[PDB]
Amino acid sequence: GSHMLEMIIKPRVRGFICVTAHPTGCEANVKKQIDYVTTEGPIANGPKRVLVIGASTGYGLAARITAAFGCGADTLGVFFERPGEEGKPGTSGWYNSAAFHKFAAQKGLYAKSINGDAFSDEIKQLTIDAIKQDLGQVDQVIYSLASPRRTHPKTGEVFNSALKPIGNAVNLRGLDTDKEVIKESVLQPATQSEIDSTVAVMGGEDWQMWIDALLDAGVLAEGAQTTAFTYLGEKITHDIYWNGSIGAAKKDLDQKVLAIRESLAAHGGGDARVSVLKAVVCQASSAIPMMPLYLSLLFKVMKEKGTHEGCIEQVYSLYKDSLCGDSPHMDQEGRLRADYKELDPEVQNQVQQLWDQVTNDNIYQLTDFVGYKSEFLNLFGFGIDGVDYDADVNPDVKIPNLIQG
Ligand SMILES: NC(=O)C1=CN([C@@H]2O[C@H](COP(=O)(O)OP(=O)(O)OC[C@H]3O[C@@H](n4cnc5c(N)ncnc54)[C@H](O)[C@@H]3O)[C@@H](O)[C@H]2O)C=CC1
Numbered sequence: 397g398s399h400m401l402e403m404i405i406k407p408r409v410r411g412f413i414c415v416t417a418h419p420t421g422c423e424a425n426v427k428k429q430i431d432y433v434t435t436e437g438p439i440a441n442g443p444k445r446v447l448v449i450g451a452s453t454g455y456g457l458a459a460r461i462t463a464a465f466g467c468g469a470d471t472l473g474v475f476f477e478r479p480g481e482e483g484k485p486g487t488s489g490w491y492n493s494a495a496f497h498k499f500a501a502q503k504g505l506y507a508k509s510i511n512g513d514a515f516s517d518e519i520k521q522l523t524i525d526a527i528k529q530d531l532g533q534v535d536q537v538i539y540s541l542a543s544p545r546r547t548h549p550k551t552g553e554v555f556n557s558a559l560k561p562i563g564n565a566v567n568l569r570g571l572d573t574d575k576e577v578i579k580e581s582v583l584q585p586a587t588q589s590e591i592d593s594t595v596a597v598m599g600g601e602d603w604q605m606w607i608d609a610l611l612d613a614g615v616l617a618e619g620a621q622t623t624a625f626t627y628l629g630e631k632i633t634h635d636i637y638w639n640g641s642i643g644a645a646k647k648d649l650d651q652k653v654l655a656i657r658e659s660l661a662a663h664g665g666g667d668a669r670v671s672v673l674k675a676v677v678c679q680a681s682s683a684i685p686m687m688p689l690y691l692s693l694l695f696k697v698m699k700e701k702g703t704h705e706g707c708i709e710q711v712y713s714l715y716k717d718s719l720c721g722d723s724p725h726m727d728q729e730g731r732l733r734a735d736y737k738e739l740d741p742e743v744q745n746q747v748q749q750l751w752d753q754v755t756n757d758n759i760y761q762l763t764d765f766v767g768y769k770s771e772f773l774n775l776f777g778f779g780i781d782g783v784d785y786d787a788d789v790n791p792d793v794k795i796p797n798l799i800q801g
Pocket of ligand 1: 449450451452453454455456457474475476477489512513514515539540541542543624625626627628672673674675676677678679680
C-alpha cells in the first residue's frame with residue numbers, strides 16, 4: 397500500500413514557524429513566479445551563467461527564476477534545506493528547488509544545486525568545482541543569504557545575530573500572529589558582543605570570501621557582476637535597520653563591498669553592489685512581531701495605490717531596470733534601489749498614521765492582515781490555486797543534480 401509512504405500535508409504552526417510544507421503547492425508557487433516572468437517578457441543583456449547563494453526561497457529564489465526564465469541563464473544555486481522523508485515534509489526551500497530543477501530542464505536550462513552551509517570553505521570549494529566542471533565561469537553572483545547564525549569558517553566560533561537597538565531601549569509595537577493581538581514590547585540595547593556578532597552574521601565578510609574564493613579559481617567572467625540584497629526601510633523599523641545591530645551589519649556591508657569592488661575592478665573591470673529591496677512576507681516574518689503589523693499595513697496601503705508586489709515582481713524589476721538595463725536607481729552611497737514604491741512619502745505617511753490607530757478590534761478594518769496570513773501560508777505551499785489539498789502526496793521529493801554538502 398502506497399498509503400503507508402504518502403500523507404495528507406496540512407499547515408502545522410509552532411512558535412510563529414510553519415513546520416510543514418506542501419510539495420505540490422511549492423511547485424505551483426514556483427510555477428506562478430515563472431509564469432509572471434515569462435508573461436512580463438525576456439530581459440536582454442543579462443548574465444548567462446549565474447551563481448545564487450541563498451537560492452531556495454524568497455528573494456534568492458526570485459533571482460534564480462528571473463535569471464533563468466527572464467535572462468535565459470544557466471543557474472547554480474546554493475542553499476541549506478531539509479529533504480523530505482516518510483511522515484516528515486521537508487522544508488519549503490527543498491520543494492521549491494525540486495520544482496525549479498523540474499521546470500528548468502523542461503526549458504532546456506542547466507540547473508544544479510548545492511545543499512550545505514554556504515559560510516563554510518567546503519561548500520565554496522564544491523561550488524567552484526561545479527562551475528569548473530559545467531560552466532567554466534559565472535557572469536553574476538547573487539548573495540541572498542538570511543540566517544540567524546554563522547559558524548566562522550576559520551575559528552569555528554558560532555556567531556548569533558541580534559535584533560536590538562543601539563544606545564537606548566525602544567518600545568516596538570507588533571502583531572502576535574498566534575494570539576492575533578496587537579502587542580508592544582521593549583527591546584533592550586545591544587551589547588558590543590551582540591553588535592559584533594550581528595555584523596559577523598549579516599555583514600559583508602562572507603560575501604567577500606565568496607568573491608575572493610571565486611576570483612582566485614578563475615571562475616568569474618570578464619565584466620562579471622555581483623550584488624547582495626538588503627533592507628533599509630523607513631522610520632517605523634529604523635531603530636533596528638538604520639541605527640540598530642542590523643544597521644551596523646548594513647554599514648559593514650557598505651564597507652566590505654568597497655573591498656569586494658576593488659577585488660573585482662582589478663579582475664577585468666568587474667563590480668560589486670548592494671541592492672535594496674522592499675519588505676515582503678518571509679518565513680521568519682511572524683517571529684519578529686513588528687513585521688506582521690508593518691506588512692499588514694503596508695500591503696493595504698500599497699494595494700490601494702496599485703503598487704503591492706512580492707519577491708518575483710521586485711527582483712524582475714531589479715534585473716530589468718538596474719542590473720541589466722539603462723534606467724537604474726543609484727542612491728548616494730552607490731546602492732541599487734528597488735524599494736522606492738515602499739518608501740513613497742505618502743505611503744509611509746499613511747502607514748505611519750495607521751500604525752498609531754490600529755488596535756486589537758480594528759485590525760481587519762485598518763490592515764490587510766488577511767493578505768499577510770495568506771501570503772505567509774503561500775510560502776510553504778498552502779492556499780495555492782489549482783492544488784488539491786485532499787490528495788495524498790509522497791513527502792520524499794527528490795532533486796537531480798543536487799550536491800549534498
Ligand atoms: N524578507 C524581506 O523583507 C527582505 C529581505 N531582504 C534580503 O533578501 C535576502 C534573502 O532574505 P529572505 O528572502 O528574507 O530570506 P529567506 O529566508 O527566504 O531565504 C534565505 C536563503 O538563505 C539560505 N540559507 C540560510 N542559511 C544558509 C546557510 N548557512 N548556508 C546556505 N544557505 C543558507 C536559505 O536556504 C535560503 O535560500 C537577504 O539578504 C535579506 O536581507 C531584503 C529586503 C527585504
